Design a protein around this ligand. Structure first.
Ligand SMILES: [Ca+2]
Ligand SMILES: [Ca+2]
Ligand SMILES: [Ca+2]
Ligand SMILES: [Ca+2]
Ligand SMILES: [Ca+2]
Ligand SMILES: [Zn+2]
Ligand SMILES: [Zn+2]
Length: 651
């Protein structure tokens, strides 16, 4: 064999970055918090076949060659300890592999970034700039904040959200008195200073447009942090680039008269404390993209700015088929939806997998995911599998369905994705094989003559059947088409059950018997066609089966009213029985039946095997006789016609 894969993962995400605190990330620097941290591993045999269904913690273990740094439990689970480089290893029979792993030091406040170099505001008005906390790596870092002015009488200051619980705060510098001073920032150990110069300017000219937030709205229903808005404010500035006033309330903003990009929104002023803000919100929006906004001061037009709509969380995007074919078995139970889905890899915007988790037993994610992007499916043959117009017909509450099976055959199912996903159709071939002998448990099945009547036959075999299964049959002058495997028993065609070595069927020679073997859930697995050979059928006895030559006899040595039955040359252990003497012959039983049958023993109740017997009789009366074999079975039958010549006389 050969180990084909050895990955570090947490909730089906290949980890790249890991910290000592146990917090991990993907490739896109996105944190992971679902599932357990573990080591993924896959194995291939010597030919290149992936081994599966194996036990993690029995068929293959795990160890950490550097436990001073990191523990890797045998099952596969992981719990890091301290920063460093650690080695990990796997076992299976006699294999072995190894890969490095690295625990990074926990993030710590390194840099305090700034969105300016020196602030300048008008007396009485208020200014603004951003701050970004960065760790030693240069990524975002959460922490608290304190801000102060060296000269509050000259310039006060305020910060949002209490200056706690984020990695991005907004500073708000309210300009008090004319002069120059400095603002001191404080977070943890480190400190940063901002030069401030309040100036009493105000010759208008030049208008600015400021985007406070990310400048985006997420039309997804669970974006975090809550990003369902864009926050704006209009400022008048002087020539020297210093804010002199706010006029957000005296301005008219307008989008296009009618949508042209599927990006639709609504603007609205939200006044409070004399401080006016212009808020943007979603108005439906079918698509993502930019939407330019036109500012106006009553009738003028000042400047334009573009906002951006997005939809996130998770949206199916990439899809690939593995094989250009699948062939079904009984385990599919007659619904080609299960095995189909397995022949498809799905990945989201991030090229990240999407799967039906077992945490959601009665609902499929990979399915429900595909439902959102699928438009239709076109079966090449509807008589085999029904095409899909409506997608809401697909569902998974354990019963994963349904591309139901109608008939045995082979088809082409092409899928129709939305133009939204821009995903080209993907064709898959599907074989629906008909049942055959291969799926038959009961061995050595052939037909034999019946014993109930004539023109009939019987079933029999060697071993018994896999407990739970059953048999049904049909018959016509032609053969019945074999059904697709997994199909339910067409209880209309096949309704006649078979209990082996008992049930029997009326039929003629040249005809055809079709059969099927069902499972516990009444699904087809087997199929075998019998042609009726004339010898397989049953018939009544004749003089043919009658071997012995019997001679009715009278004379002056036999009792009157009675006749002597002279037996001559029968076979070894064969026996003979006689019926009542009537004016008409008795009924002739079937060849093969036992003597012990009630309809028989009652009729032919008089054994005369000895040939030394005499029973009542008359001239034209008839008498019926039968021949039994060495095993207690009937063989022959001959109805004699008597004459007075062979009747007794004297007393
Ligand atoms: Ca939203
Ligand atoms: Ca926002
Ligand atoms: Ca638009
Ligand atoms: Ca699930
Ligand atoms: Ca036969
Ligand atoms: Zn076979
Ligand atoms: Zn017919």
């Amino acid at each position: 064999a050969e180990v084909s894969e050895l990955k570090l993962t947490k909730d089906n995400k290949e980890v790249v970055t890991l910290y000592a605190n146990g917090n991990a990330f993907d490739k896109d620097g996105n944190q992971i918090s679902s599932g357990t941290l573990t080591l993924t591993a896959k194995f291939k045999d010597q030919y290149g076949n992936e081994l599966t269904g194996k036990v993690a913690g029995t068929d293959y273990t795990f160890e950490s060659l550097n436990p001073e740094v990191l523990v890797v439990a045998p099952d596969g689970s992981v719990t890091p300890i301290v920063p460093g480089t650690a080695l990990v290893k796997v076992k299976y029979g006699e294999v072995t592999k190894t890969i490095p792993v690295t625990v990074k030091a926990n993030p710590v406040l390194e840099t305090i970034a700034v969105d300016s170099t020196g602030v300048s505001v008008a007396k009485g008005q208020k200014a603004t700039f951003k701050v970004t906390l960065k760790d030693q790596y240069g990524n975002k870092f959460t922490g608290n904040v304190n801000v102060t002015s060296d000269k509050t009488e000259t310039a006060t200051v305020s910060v949002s959200n209490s200056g706690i619980g984020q990695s991005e705060y907004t500073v708000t510098v309210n300009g008090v008195a004319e002069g120059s001073t400095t603002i001191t920032i404080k977070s943890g150990t480190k400190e940063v200073k901002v030069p401030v110069n309040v100036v009493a300017g105000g010759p208008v000219a030049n208008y600015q447009i400021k985007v406070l937030d990310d400048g985006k709205i997420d039309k997804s229903a669970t974006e975090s942090p809550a990003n369902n808005d864009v926050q704006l404010k209009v400022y008048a500035v002087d020539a020297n680039g210093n804010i002199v006033g706010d006029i957000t309330n005296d301005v008219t903003i307008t989008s296009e008269a009618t949508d042209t990009n599927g990006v639709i929104v609504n603007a609205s002023k939200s006044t409070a404390n004399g401080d006016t803000v212009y808020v943007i919100t979603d108005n439906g929006s079918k698509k993502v993209g930019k939407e330019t906004l036109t500012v106006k001061l009553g009738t003028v037009t000042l400047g334009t700015v573009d906002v951006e709509v997005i939809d996130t969380t998770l949206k199916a995007t990439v899809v690939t088929k593995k094989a250009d074919l699948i062939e079904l078995d009984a385990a599919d139970n007659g619904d080609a939806l299960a095995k189909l889905l397995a022949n498809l890899d799905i990945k989201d915007q991030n090229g990240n997998p999407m799967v039906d988790s077992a945490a959601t037993p009665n609902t499929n994610e990979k399915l429900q995911a595909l439902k959102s992007v699928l438009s239709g499916i076109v079966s090449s043959d509807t008589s085999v599998i029904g095409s899909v117009s409506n997608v809401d017909n697909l569902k998974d509450d354990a019963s994963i369905s349904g591309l139901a099976v109608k008939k045995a055959g082979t088809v082409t199912l092409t899928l129709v994705f939305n133009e939204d996903s821009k995903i080209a159709p993907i064709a898959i071939t599907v074989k629906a094989p008909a049942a055959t002998q291969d799926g038959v448990t009961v061995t050595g099945l052939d037909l034999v003559p019946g014993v109930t009547g004539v023109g009939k036959t019987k079933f029999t075999a060697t071993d018994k059947i896999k407990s739970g299964h059953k048999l049904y049959y049909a018959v016509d002058d032609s053969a019945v088409p074999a059904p697709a495997v997994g199909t339910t028993r067409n209880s209309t065609k096949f309704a006649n059950e078979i209990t082996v070595g008992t049930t029997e069927v009326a039929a003629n020679a040249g005809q055809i018997i079709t059969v099927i073997e069902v499972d516990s859930s009444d699904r087809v697995v087997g199929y075998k066609t019998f042609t009726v050979e004339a010898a397989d059928l049953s018939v009544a006895a004749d003089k043919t089966g009658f071997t012995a030559t019997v001679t009715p006899t009278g004379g002056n040595q036999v009792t009157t009213g009675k006749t002597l039955l002279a037996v001559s040359d029968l076979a070894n252990g064969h026996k003979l029985y006689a019926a009542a003497a009537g004016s008409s012959a008795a009924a002739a039983p079937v060849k093969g039946i036992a003597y012990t049958d009630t309809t028989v023993r009652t009729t032919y109740g008089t054994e005369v095997t000895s040939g030394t017997v005499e029973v009542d009789a008359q001239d034209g009366q008839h008498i019926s006789i039968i021949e039994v074999d060495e095993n207690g079975k009937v063989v022959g039958y001959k109805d004699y016609t008597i004459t007075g010549i062979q009747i007794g006389t004297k007393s």
